[PDB]
C-alpha cells in the first residue's frame, strides 16, 4: 500500500503574470546626466548573468499572448510621463506667431518658418518680442502677413522635455522577483507560437534598448540564425509582419543644419529653448542605406516569405498606404529630436522568379504627441551642431495587403504605429513562470504514530 508524501522545492512552474522589476548595467552609472530618461533607480544588473540550460523540457510559448510586452509598454509610458512632468510647461507659447519663410531663395520646399511673437518675460508687467525657427509640421496657420500657432495649442497642453535628460535607450533588463523565473527559447527556428525545444531558465533577459520606431527596428537584437518572419495569424494581413534580420543593415541618419539654441526666459525660473538662426547651409535631413545591402536583405526576406505563402509567388513592395505622419513614414529619434523619413525608396521592388547608397528625405517635427496620449504633447528642444547617428536596421514591421478573387502577387507595405510590436521583437523568446514548489507524490514511506 502507498502513502502520500510532500516534496518542497520541486521543479514545477506554471504560467502567470507578475510585476517585473528592472536591472541596469553599472557601466553607464557614471552617466547619470541628471536622471537620464529611463534608468534612475534601476538596481545594478547581475555581475555574473547566470543562465541555466535545461533538457527534456518543452514549453508552449506565445509571443502574441505574452503579458511581458504589456508590462513593458505600460512601464515605458509611465516612465515617459514621470520624466516629462518635472520639466518646463510651455502653456504661454500658444500665441499668434507672425511667421515668414526662412531667409532663402526659390526652391525651398516651407519646412523652416521664422516666427516672431510677443512672449512674456520674467516681470509680469513687461512683455517681450522674440523669434524662433519652427518646422512647418509643428505650426499651423490660423485664418497682413500669415499668422501661425503651434500644432498642439487647441487639443493638448504642450510640455517641453527639459534638456538635462536624454533619450538614449539604455539596456533595460526586465527582471522577475523571487518565486518567478524567465524561460528563454534559445533555438534557431521559432516562429513565435508552439512548443520550444531548447527552453532554458534565467533570472531575466539581456540588455533591451527600448527604441521607439516605426517601419524599422533600429538598434534591435538580430535573429537566431537566418531572417525570421513572425506574424500572429499568417492569413490575417493586418497582423504586423515582424521580420528579424540576421545581418544588421547600416543606416546613417544626419541632421546637417547647424542649429543655435536661444534660451528665452518665459517665466521666473521657467526657460524655453528655441531654434536660433541656422548658421551654415540650409539642407534637409536624410538617412543613407547602402543599396546593395538593402537589396540583398530584401532578397533574403522575400526568399523567406516564399515559404509561408505558396511554393513560388510574386512579392511586391510599395510605400505606406496612408495615415498619420508617424505611420506613413519611418519615425525615430537620432540626437534628441524625433523625425520621420518617408522611406519610399526602400520599398519599391518586385520579385517573381529570379556600389552606392539610397537617400531618403527626413522631415523633423519637434512638437510630438507619441503614443496618441490626447491632451499631453511633448516639445523636443533643439540640439546644437550637426546631428549624426549610425544605426542598425535589424527588423521590419510590415503588413500584407488585402487579397482578391485571385491573388498571385501579394504586396507588403510598411506600417506598425503601435509600439507593442517594438517590444514583441525582444520579448518573444521570454516568458515568466511562477514556481509551485509543493508536490504530493505516492511512495512506500509512512510516518509513525
Amino acid at each position, epitope marked *: 500500500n502507498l502513502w502520500v508524501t510532500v516534496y518542497y522545492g520541486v521543479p514545477v512552474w506554471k504560467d502567470a503574470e507578475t510585476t517585473l522589476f528592472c536591472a541596469s548595467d553599472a557601466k553607464a552609472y557614471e552617466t547619470e546626466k541628471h536622471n537620464v530618461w529611463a534608468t534612475h533607480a534601476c538596481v545594478p544588473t547581475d555581475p555574473n548573468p547566470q543562465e541555466i540550460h535545461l533538457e527534456n523540457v518543452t514549453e508552449e510559448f506565445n509571443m502574441w499572448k505574452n503579458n511581458m510586452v504589456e508590462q513593458m509598454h505600460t512601464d515605458i509610458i509611465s516612465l515617459w510621463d514621470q520624466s516629462l512632468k518635472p520639466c518646463v510647461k510651455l502653456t504661454p507659447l500658444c500665441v499668434t506667431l507672425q511667421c515668414t519663410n526662412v531667409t532663402n531663395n526659390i526652391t525651398d520646399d516651407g519646412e523652416l518658418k521664422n516666427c516672431s511673437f510677443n512672449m512674456t518675460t520674467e516681470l509680469r508687467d513687461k512683455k517681450q518680442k522674440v523669434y524662433s525657427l519652427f518646422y512647418r509640421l509643428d505650426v499651423v496657420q490660423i485664418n497682413s502677413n500669415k499668422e501661425y500657432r503651434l500644432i498642439n495649442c*487647441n*487639443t493638448s497642453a504642450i510640455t517641453q522635455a527639459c534638456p538635462k535628460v536624454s533619450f538614449e535607450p539604455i539596456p533595460i533588463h526586465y527582471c522577475a522577483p523571487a518565486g518567478f523565473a524567465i524561460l528563454k527559447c534559445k533555438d534557431k527556428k521559432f516562429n513565435g507560437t508552439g512548443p520550444c525545444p531548447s527552453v532554458s531558465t534565467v533570472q531575466c533577459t539581456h540588455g533591451i534598448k527600448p527604441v521607439v520606431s516605426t517601419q524599422l527596428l533600429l538598434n534591435g537584437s538580430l535573429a537566431e540564425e537566418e531572417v525570421m518572419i513572425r506574424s*500572429e*495569424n499568417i*492569413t*490575417n*494581413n*493586418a*497582423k504586423n509582419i515582424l521580420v528579424q534580420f540576421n545581418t544588421p543593415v547600416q543606416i546613417n541618419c544626419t541632421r546637417p543644419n547647424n542649429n543655435t539654441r536661444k534660451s528665452i526666459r518665459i517665466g521666473p525660473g521657467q526657460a524655453f529653448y528655441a531654434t536660433g538662426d541656422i548658421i551654415g547651409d540650409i539642407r534637409q535631413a536624410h538617412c543613407n542605406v547602402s543599396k546593395a545591402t538593402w537589396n540583398e536583405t530584401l532578397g533574403k526576406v522575400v526568399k523567406q516569405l516564399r515559404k509561408h505563402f505558396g511554393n513560388n509567388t510574386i512579392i511586391r513592395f510599395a510605400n505606406s*498606404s*496612408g*495615415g*498619420d505622419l*508617424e*505611420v506613413t513614414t519611418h519615425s525615430f529619434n537620432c540626437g534628441g529630436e524625433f523625425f520621420y523619413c518617408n522611406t519610399s525608396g526602400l520599398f519599391n521592388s518586385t520579385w517573381i522568379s529570379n556600389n552606392d547608397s539610397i537617400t531618403l528625405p527626413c522631415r523633423i517635427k519637434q512638437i510630438i504627441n507619441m503614443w*496618441q496620449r*490626447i491632451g499631453q504633447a511633448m516639445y523636443a528642444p533643439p540640439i546644437q551642431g550637426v546631428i549624426r547617428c549610425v544605426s542598425n536596421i535589424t527588423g521590419l514591421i510590415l*503588413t500584407r*495587403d*488585402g*487579397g*482578391s*478573387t485571385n*491573388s498571385t502577387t501579394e504586396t507588403f507595405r510598411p*506600417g506598425g*504605429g*503601435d509600439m507593442r510590436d517594438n517590444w514583441r521583437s525582444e520579448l518573444y523568446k521570454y516568458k515568466v513562470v511562477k514556481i509551485e514548489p509543493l508536490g504530493v507524490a505516492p511512495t512506500r514511506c509512512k510516518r509513525r504514530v
Partner: antibody
Amino acid sequence: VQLVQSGAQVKKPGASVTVSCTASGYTFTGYHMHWVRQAPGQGLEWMGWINPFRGGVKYAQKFRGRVSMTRDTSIEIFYMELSRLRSDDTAVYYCAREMFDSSADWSPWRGMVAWGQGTLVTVSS
Amino acid sequence: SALTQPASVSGSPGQSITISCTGSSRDVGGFDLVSWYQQHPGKAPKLMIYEVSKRPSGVSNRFSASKSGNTASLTISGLQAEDEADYYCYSYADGVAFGGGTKLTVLG
C-alpha cells in the same frame, strides 16, 4: 452609439468627393471603421478600413489609388476622399463601426454592428 | 462578387427558409466568420448574425446560421412581414467580400 454622416452630394464625372462620418457614444480610438459603398440597385461593396489609433488605413483593391481615408481624433470624424470620379461612383456610402476592438480578440474580420445614415453621391455628365 | 447568393427567395409566414452563400475554399470554408446583415429597402444594414453562427444583440432567436464545407446557410424560422427586406452574406476572402444580395418576400 451614433454615426452621423453628411448630406447627399452632386459631383461631376472627374471630380473629388469628400464625405465625413462623425461618431458619438464610445471610445473613438479603439474601434475600426469600414467604408462601404453601394450602387443603388446593386450589391454591397467594400472600400477600406481605418484604425483610429495612428489612423492605419487599408483600402480595397478596386479603389486603391483613388480613395484616401483619414480621421480627426480631436473632433472624432472619419474623412473619405475619392478622386477620379466616374459615372459608376453614383452610390450611397456608409461608415460601419466594427463589432469589437481591433487590438483585442481580433485576428480575423467580423462585425459591422453600427452603420451611418448613408450619403448619396450623384455623378452624372 | 466573391460569393453567389440566390437572386430572390420567398416563403410563407411562420415557416422556415434557408438562404445559401456559396463561396470558395479560401473565403467561406477557410475561415469561420460568415456573417449575415439585414438591409431594409432604403436604410442602413444591420448585423443580425455575426461570427459564423452566433447573433449580436437586438436580434431575436428567429435567425440561425450554419456552414457545410464551403457553403454557408442562413435559416429563418417563423417568417414575418417585417422580414421582407434584403439579407447579405459576408465572408473574409483575404479581405472583405460580400454576397450578391438576396431579396426576401413573404406573403406577397
